[PDB]
């Protein structure tokens, strides 16, 4: 019938895209990335042990001037910190104690959060009154918020547990574009340096690139063994950094448009909860579930050194805008700035 | 160093004082996780003490603070956010005892009892819940006393082998629930048979959280 006709059409489309992407398999990355001088070992040490929280930390985001540092935790408090002096600036009392995402605006006037309350509360740091006030409370998601990255003072891009990514504003508070197409729940969200494109990763083991201006998808990168939990851009802006729940950091492109590789490692069988980048792009950093982080040489596909230091699993990890020091955030209510 | 730096560090230390003082009310608080099956009596246990995620209600019974984690509105999968409740003191289930007759009340494809068993096996043998107490409740049992008078109990469990009464069926459901636990050496299941208008279940919850905080006070001293 018509149902059988559309099932046959879906099968024919699957065969067509399989044949096209099998014919488009042309090159690889290993020899090109390994035709360079070998990268030496990296041995970092903790220089600022950031403490003050007393609950479990899931999220962090760096500052505008690579100096301030926001931290989200289940204590009902969002605290904005200081990297050098290990001081702190404000205390934001969260109305919802369940936060698993937070992001700091590139202008620094606003900070956002989100979690299991299925709403996004946008705060205002700069006020004539001495406090932090909620600017807009974004409502319209039926799932847990996973990432709340900022494009500018108005456009905030929010991932959520309703299998859709969203783009909002401030003057009205109404979502403009909805990014539908991920089957599973989106876990992380990474923008692009030119602030025109952004990527996402969901429970369907796929990474899909979305054009923010048109509100429609552009690319897909699937074929993985578990849920992708960590996504990150490249400083060049044309590469992925996928972190999933099988201790695998695959490297894709925003331009290769089908696939690059399926990277894996054998010594670690835990999960990955945060993946960050470096300024030169030669080295990759990932927050793991076996209580440490791994310094990944993105070219020779090697490890510069097991960069341990945390007692619990590193939930969140971030690198400054100038790449001067990394910062890991784990479940020990601590942050570990390393350089 | 400087006057701005001195005032900044004294303000930061004042906010650390605030985090200590307000955050030490978390030790007094005894948070409870509520989940299970919808329509099975979640509203009944709420009504005994705009957000589409976790619903919170606050109540204090005999000098003890409680938190209600109504997580039933989270329509997504439970795998990627149940890890936020590692340190919850007690878990409260509300599965309907009046469940052997009706299969879904929306369609004919499975049993709500089978779904309750699958969920119980999922969140009892969980790696993240290997040391957490359960206050599993078999609610609306007053209505269970009429549907067993006519419909035989073999329509759900074909291992009855006896006259269809209340106590044998209740014991069979108890045997089918209290065997899913992988180890009772570290877990207790505080099963209480309650109803829609049944009172004094709050003291049962209080006794259960009393037992788990006494095992906590045995834990922190290091001998247990």
């Amino acid at each position: 019938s018509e149902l059988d006709q559309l099932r046959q059409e879906a099968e024919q489309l699957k065969n067509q895209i399989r044949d096209a992407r099998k014919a488009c398999a042309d090159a690889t990355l290993s020899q090109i990335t390994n035709n360079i001088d070998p990268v030496g070992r990296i041995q970092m040490r903790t220089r600022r042990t950031l403490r003050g929280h007393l609950a479990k930390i899931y999220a962090m985001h760096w500052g505008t001037d690579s100096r301030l540092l926001v931290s989200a935790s289940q204590d009902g408090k969002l605290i904005i910190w200081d990297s050098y002096t290990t001081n702190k600036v404000h205390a934001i009392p969260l109305r919802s104690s369940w936060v698993m995402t937070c992001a700091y605006a590139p202008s620094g006037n606003y900070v956002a959060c989100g979690g299991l309350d299925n709403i996004c509360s946008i705060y205002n740091l700069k006020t004539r009154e001495g406090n932090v006030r909620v600017s807009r409370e974004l409502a319209g998601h039926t799932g847990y918020l996973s990432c709340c990255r900022f494009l500018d003072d108005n456009q905030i891009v929010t991932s959520s547990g309703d299998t859709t990514c969203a783009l909002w504003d401030i003057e009205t508070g109404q979502q403009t574009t909805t990014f539908t197409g991920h089957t599973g729940d989106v876990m992380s969200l990474s923008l692009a340096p030119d602030t025109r494109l952004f990527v996402s990763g969901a429970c369907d083991a796929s990474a899909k690139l979305w054009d923010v201006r048109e509100g429609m998808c552009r690319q897909t990168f699937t074929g993985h063994e578990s849920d992708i939990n960590a996504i990150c851009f490249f400083p060049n802006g044309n590469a992925f950094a996928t972190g999933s729940d099988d201790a695998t950091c695959r490297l894709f492109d925003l331009r290769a448009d089908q696939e690059l590789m399926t990277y894996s490692h054998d010594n670690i069988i835990c999960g990955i909860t945060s993946v960050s980048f470096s300024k030169s792009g030669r080295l990759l950093l990932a927050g793991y579930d076996d209580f440490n982080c791994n310094v990944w040489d993105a070219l020779k596909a090697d490890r510069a050194g097991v960069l341990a230091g945390h007692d619990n699993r590193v939930s969140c990890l971030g690198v400054t805008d100038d790449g001067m020091a990394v910062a890991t955030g784990s479940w020990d209510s601590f942050l570990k700035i390393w350089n | 160093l400087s006057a701005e730096d001195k005032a900044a560090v004294e303000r930061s230390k004042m906010i650390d004082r605030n985090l200590r003082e307000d955050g030490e009310k978390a030790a007094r608080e005894v948070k409870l996780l509520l989940l299970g099956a919808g329509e099975s009596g979640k509203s009944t246990i709420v009504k005994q003490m705009k957000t589409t995620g976790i619903v919170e209600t606050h109540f204090t019974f005999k000098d003890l603070h409680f938190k209600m984690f109504d997580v039933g509105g989270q329509r997504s999968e439970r795998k990627k956010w149940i890890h936020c409740f590692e340190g919850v003191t007690a878990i409260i289930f509300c599965v309907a005892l009046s469940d052997y007759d009706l299969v879904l009340a929306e369609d004919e494809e499975m049993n709500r009892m089978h779904e309750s068993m699958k969920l119980f096996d999922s969140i009892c043998n969980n790696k993240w819940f290997t040391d957490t107490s359960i206050i599993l409740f078999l609610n609306k049992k007053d209505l269970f006393e009429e549907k067993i008078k006519k419909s035989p109990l073999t329509i759900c469990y074909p291992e009855y082998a006896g006259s269809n009464t209340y106590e044998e069926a209740a014991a069979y459901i108890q045997c089918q629930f209290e065997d899913l636990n992988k180890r009772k050496d570290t877990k207790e299941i505080y099963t209480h048979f309650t109803c829609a208008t049944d009172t004094k279940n709050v003291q049962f919850v209080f006794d259960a959280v009393t037992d788990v905080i006494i095992k906590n006070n045995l834990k922190d001293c290091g001998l247990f």
Epitope: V89, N131 | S2, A3, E4, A8
Partner: single-chain antibody, 232 residues
Framework: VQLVESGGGLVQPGGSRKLSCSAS????????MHWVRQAPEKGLEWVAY????????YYADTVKGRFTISRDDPKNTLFLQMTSLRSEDTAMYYC??????????????WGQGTTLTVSSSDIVMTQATSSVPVTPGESVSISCRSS???????????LYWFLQRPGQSPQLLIY???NLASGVPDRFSGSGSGTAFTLTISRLEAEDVGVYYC?????????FGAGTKLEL
């Protein structure tokens, strides 16, 4: 709202008065409150300081143990208990709030002031210019010279520039490198890579009239500079 000052009037020499700051409409418990006076014919000078929650109380070197500054957090008020009111204290008093963190804006608000009339190794900075005749639309620079350097290993200069319109209260201007105040036009631009201070004002308007004041916050007391009246 605004910081409102209560009390005043003629007082006996060496006696006591009832001077307070009945201020409201602001988050009082987070600001490092100040008190700044000025003579009827002389510029401003710091006289008191308390931090948030009265954690740290400072004074000027000439007022140590002479005045009593206290705060009241629940009523958001600000007290000033006097002792031994000499005729040298014949000055009107301002109430100043100052928040203190990274990238904060101290001295960002000043009260309307109250008039107290008495009846019958410190760092020193000054402005050589005074009573400068200006014309609208013309670039007018300013000069302040400090005795000691204000830079650090971090690279932060602690110069503060102010403005008092005639018949009004002082306002705030540049206080860092390219960091202006709130409600201030962007024509102002402080400069000076050392212990010399200059405002490179691009254009002058009718609202850019008044007396400029040069300030430090490196050490206490927070003594001001000399008056520089930018009259027409």
């Amino acid at each position: 709202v605004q910081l409102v000052e209560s009390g005043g009037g003629l007082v006996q020499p060496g006696g006591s008065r009832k001077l307070s700051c009945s201020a409201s409409g602001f988050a009082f418990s987070s600001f490092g409150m100040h008190w700044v006076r000025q003579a009827p014919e002389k510029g401003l000078e710091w006289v008191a300081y308390i931090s948030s929650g009265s954690g740290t109380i400072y004074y000027a070197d000439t007022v140590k143990g002479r005045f009593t500054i206290s705060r009241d957090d629940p009523k958001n008020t600000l007290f000033l208990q006097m002792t031994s009111l000499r005729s040298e204290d014949t000055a009107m008093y301002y109430c100043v709030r100052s928040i203190y963190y990274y990238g904060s804006s101290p001295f960002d608000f000043w009260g309307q002031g109250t008039t107290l009339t008495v009846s019958s190794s410190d760092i020193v900075m000054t402005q050589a210019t005074s009573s400068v005749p200006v014309t609208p639309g013309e670039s007018v620079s300013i000069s302040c010279r400090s005795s000691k350097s204000l830079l650090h290993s971090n690279g932060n200069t602690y110069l503060y520039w102010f403005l008092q319109r005639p018949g009004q209260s002082p306002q705030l201007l540049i206080y860092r490198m390219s960091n202006l105040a709130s409600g201030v036009p962007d024509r102002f631009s402080g400069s000076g890579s050392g212990t010399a201070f200059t405002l490179t004002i691009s254009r002058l308007e009718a609202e850019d009239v008044g007396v400029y004041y040069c300030m430090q916050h490196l050490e206490y007391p927070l003594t001001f500079g000399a008056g520089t009246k930018l009259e027409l």
